[PDB]
């Protein structure tokens, strides 16, 4: 019950911050809060476990708006970088 | 450029070691953007950045007991209070 | 080019409807419009191909808010229905 | 109720034929709601009903040529105009 009280106080006190925590800090705070109060997520969110598909979308979405030419140019530079690093 | 792209795309198959995950992501993203262009549909949720972030954040803590998660929240909250002030 | 013109006219004329088409009609209209102008969807949207996971979420989400008792009661009636239909 | 649920859940494993998809969905949804309760997280996108509907609608037409999709759009549009009026 000591922990419960300290949790209740921490949760309200973090509302008083004089500056906004960065994204990763807000994620850690949120994750812990839910896990503490709710426990494990209780359903497999479709796709969320599709790590390959998510990675491809994220990777490709990052390049949204790059023209054909600029994406082609960049691919070559990246490929050359990996070839230099690892060898062929 | 086209010829250099075709050669680079084939040559990268010859690598003597597997690039790390971030390296493969950058290569894949550029390859698709080059050959295909913009993704042509809004993938449901994928643009739901708030919802995605919450799921990732919370999924990372899968398996922590109530007590450990409670204890850790308090430490994190106190950590943020020390860092930013109240 | 005859088809293109008829498409352009149909697409603008459907805006003039005196009543809103039902959901399935709007879906068919939208699907055809995109397929005509854009072609195939060009990325696998994570999860969207996870048909098992999507079906479970949809099935369970439909029951959101049912109390334990009412969901338990209903499960039994449903199970009894399937047992009567198919046999055991 | 609990006992009747436990018996029903086991007995439905004994079915002599596989229920259709909608039947399995209803059974599954009720089972989870009974044992687990409400889904405890908003699954990204799943609540994006507009985006989901668009993807489903468009995915259904995967593989139609430009011409066939164009021709069919016109027929559908004319169909809706005849039905609802303009
Ligand atoms: O703030 P915000 O950006 O407006 O976020 P929301 O309005 O979506 O709600 C805040 C979320 O953080 C959670 N939260 C509330 N107080 C919190 C706290 N003190 N510490 C960590 N997380 C907290 C809420 O439960 C909510 O989660 P939910 O979406 O699973 O219900
Ligand atoms: O390779 P793999 O990871 O073993 O096979 P995967 O099915 O996971 O996908 C490979 C991806 O890399 C892409 N790809 C193929 N050659 C590539 C190359 N030389 N450089 C970067 N990406 C390439 C493919 O298009 C495919 O993407 P897609 O499925 O979206 O079309
Ligand atoms: O109308 P609405 O409910 O506001 O829908 P939106 O604002 O999201 O846009 C309408 C969609 O229908 C499409 N659309 C536009 N005109 C259309 C038409 N005449 N027939 C069928 N679909 C059409 C648009 O391209 C848009 O698709 P998108 O989301 O892939 O870009
Ligand atoms: O059965 P199966 O389709 O071969 O196995 P699956 O992995 O696809 O899932 C079976 C699901 O039915 C559920 N289930 C188990 N027994 C059940 C029953 N008697 N009635 C309804 N649902 C049941 C399981 O909990 C599981 O759901 P979950 O993965 O979300 O926890
Ligand atoms: C990552 C999803 C949203 C994050 C939700 C964080 C919970 C709110 C509590 C921390 C508030 C700190 C802001 C004070 C300024
Ligand atoms: C996220 C999707 C990844 C797509 C990857 C495209 C393939 C690029 C080449 C991979 C590196 C070549 C493998 C050699 C490793 C051995 O050694
Ligand atoms: C299913 C996603 C949204 C549907 C988009 C439909 C495209 C709009 C054209 C039809 C408008 C008919 C409404 C007139 C009243
Ligand atoms: C969508 C997820 C489905 C979950 C299904 C739960 C299992 C219920 C029992 C299935 C029917 C029993 C199989 C007997 C068929 C043979 O014959």
Curated annotation (Swiss-Prot), chains A, C:
Disulfide bond entries: none
Domain annotation ACB: ranges: 3-88
- Family listed: Belongs to the ACBD7 family.
Q: What are this entry's molecular-function GO terms?
A: fatty-acyl-CoA binding
* Function according to Swiss-Prot or TrEMBL: Binds medium- and long-chain acyl-CoA esters.
Query: Which Pfam family name is an example for this entry?
Result: ACBP
Q: Which InterPro entries match?
A: Acyl-CoA-binding_protein (IPR000582), Acyl-CoA-binding_sf (IPR035984), FERM/acyl-CoA-bd_prot_sf (IPR014352)
**An individual GO BP term:** fatty acid metabolic process
Sites binding an acyl-CoA sit at: 15, 30-34, 56, 75
* Record's protein name: Acyl-CoA-binding domain-containing protein 7
Q: Which UniProt keywords apply?
A: Lipid-binding
Family annotation (Gene3D superfamilies): 1.20.80.10
């Amino acid at each position: 019950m000591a922990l419960q009280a300290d949790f209740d106080r921490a949760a309200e006190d973090v509302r008083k911050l004089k500056a906004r925590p960065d994204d990763g800090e807000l994620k850690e705070l949120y994750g812990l809060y839910k896990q503490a109060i709710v426990g494990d997520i209780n359903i497999a969110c479709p796709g969320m476990l599709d790590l390959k598909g998510k990675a491809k979308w994220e990777a490709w979405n990052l390049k949204k708006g790059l023209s054909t030419e600029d994406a082609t140019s960049a691919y070559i530079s990246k490929a050359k970088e990996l070839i230099e690093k690892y060898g062929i």
